[PDB]
Every structure is written in structure tokens, then in C-alpha cells.
Amino acid sequence: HWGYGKHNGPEHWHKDFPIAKGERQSPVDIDTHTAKYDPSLKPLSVSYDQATSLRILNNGHAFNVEFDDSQDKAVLKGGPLDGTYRLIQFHFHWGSLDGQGSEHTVDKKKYAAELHLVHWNTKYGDFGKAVQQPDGLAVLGIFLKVGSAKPGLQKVVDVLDSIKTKGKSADFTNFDPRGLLPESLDYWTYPGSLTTPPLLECVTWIVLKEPISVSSEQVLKFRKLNFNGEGEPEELMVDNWRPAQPLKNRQIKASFK
Numbered sequence: 001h002w003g004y005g006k007h008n009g010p011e012h013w014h015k016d017f018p019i020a021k022g023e024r025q026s027p028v029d030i031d032t033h034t035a036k037y038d039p040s041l042k043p044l045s046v047s048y049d050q051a052t053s054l055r056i057l058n059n060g061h062a063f064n065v066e067f068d069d070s071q072d073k074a075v076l077k078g079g080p081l082d083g084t085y086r087l088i089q090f091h092f093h094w095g096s097l098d099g100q101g102s103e104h105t106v107d108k109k110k111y112a113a114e115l116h117l118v119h120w121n122t123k124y125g126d127f128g129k130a131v132q133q134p135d136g137l138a139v140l141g142i143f144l145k146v147g148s149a150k151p152g153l154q155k156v157v158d159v160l161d162s163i164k165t166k167g168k169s170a171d172f173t174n175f176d177p178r179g180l181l182p183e184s185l186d187y188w189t190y191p192g193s194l195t196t197p198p199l200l201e202c203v204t205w206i207v208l209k210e211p212i213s214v215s216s217e218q219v220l221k222f223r224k225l226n227f228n229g230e231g232e233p234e235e236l237m238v239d240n241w242r243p244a245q246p247l248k249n250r251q252i253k254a255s256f257k
């Protein structure tokens with residue numbers, strides 16, 4: 001099945017998921033010189049005050065911090081979006097070395113990691129119906145650079161020991177995702193896709209310009225997770241990122257001058 005190795009990585013996905021070579025695939029390189037300021041964009045509204053985290057899961061590709069999305073509790077709206085999108089989970093993509101790991105790049109620059117906060121358009125009723133629509137998802141993408149620790153990340157890092165292998169989960173209540181945001185909400189936005197199979201083309205990407213800083217010790221703990229299940233040979237969960245895809249007939253818009 002799919003993964004990130006020589007034999008089952010991104011260059012192979014198209015054979016089971018032909019939409020891998022589609023017209024609005026993610027991630028992309030963000031060419032800062034080419035991305036035009038759009039003054040019709042609205043400020044982004046991130047309302048995470050009532051977010052209710054439930055659980056963290058190692059899914060064999062990444063770890064997902066899952067939220068109760070049965071009520072309008074934690075929502076993203078504004079920016080390029082029409083309507084209201086509900087937070088369902090966040091996860092990261094990261095590298096084996098600090099020089100790589102993000103999926104979007106900025107003028108070809110790769111960051112050490114990238115946080116994806118996943119939200120579904122509540123006009124579609126649930127997540128499953130939202131991923132059958134071209135405006136079904138909104139993902140807030142935030143880059144990580146290695147420097148000072150991010151205090152709001154430490155509760156995630158400290159639980160990782162308990163979900164080392166594929167299929168392991170742990171209780172993860174009362175986590176506040178506001179602690180993972182940078183100061184500024186300036187962003188770039190473009191229409192794209194999931195960056196893992198099934199690669200569906202449902203996503204309004206909103207990529208913040210300002211990275212957050214995490215410590216070398218924090219990202220080193222991400223890299224001690226395993227892609228394999230318990231009792232299987234150890235394969236470190238590193239380099240779970242897809243490289244930049246052709247932009248095709250798309251424009252990337254900036255919310256800021």
C-alpha cells in the first residue's frame with residue numbers, strides 16, 4: 001500500500017490514485033514574486049476558543065490530533081472562504097533533517113516541518129460528503145523552523161512515546177490549538193488537494209507566511225515515531241512529505257502587500 005519509501009512513495013501513487021497527475025494537486029512551490037496581493041481577500045477568522053480535542057492517533061503515515069466536530073466549536077471562516085469550516089484534526093509532515101520536511105515551499109525553500117489544520121465545509125454536513133466537493137475542505141498550513149521551543153507544542157511532543165507505532169492511539173483531551181499559531185495571520189491561498197492518497201481535489205489551501213519556531217529537541221521527538229506497527233521491523237517516521245507539484249492553471253494569491 002502507499003507510503004513514503006522507494007517502492008511505495010509519491011512517484012508511485014498515480015498508479016492507484018490517477019488524480020496524482022490532476023489539475024489541482026498539492027503541495028506547490030509559492031513563488032513570492034508571482035503571487036499577487038488580492039485586496040478582495042478578507043481577514044482570516046480562526047475561532048478556536050471552544051475547540052475540544054479528543055485523541056491522538058499514529059495512522060502509519062503521521063499522527064493525527066482529533067477534535068469533536070459534532071457541533072460548531074472550532075471554526076475557520078473569512079479569508080478566501082465562503083461559509084464556515086469546522087476543525088476536525090491537525091497533523092504534521094516533517095523531515096529526517098532540519099533542511100527538509102515541509103510540503104509547500106516558499107521560493108523553493110523547504111522548512112523543517114509543516115502543520116496542517118484540517119477543516120470541512122459545514123454546508124456538506126459531514127467530512128465524508130465534504131471530500132466529494134471542490135470546496136469541501138479548508139486547510140491552514142503553518143511552517144515550522146528549528147530555533148526556540150514552541151511551548152504550546154510540548155504537550156504533543158510528550159505524548160508521542162505512547163503512540164510510537166501504527167494503530168496506537170491515546171487520550172488527548174483539553175489541548176488548545178491556539179498555542180500552535182504564529183503572531184501574524186498573513187497568508188497565501190490557492191485551490192489544491194490532499195497531499196496524501198487519495199489525493200482528492202477538495203481543498204482551499206491557506207498557507208501562513210510567518211513560520212513558528214520549534215526546538216531541535218521537539219522535532220527530534222517527531223522523528224522517533226515509527227511508520228510500522230508494533231512487533232514489525234522499525235522504520236522511523238521521517239520524510240512523510242510530498243514534493244511540490246505542477247502549478248498548472250492556478251494563481252496563488254497573497255492576503256498582504
Ligand SMILES: On1cccc(C(F)(F)F)c1=S
Pocket residue numbers: 116117118137139193194195196203
Ligand atoms: O496530509 N493529509 C492527510 C489527509 C488529509 C489531508 C487534508 F487535510 F488535505 F484533508 C492532509 S493535508
Ligand SMILES: [Zn+2]
Pocket residue numbers: 091092093116195
Ligand atoms: Zn497534511
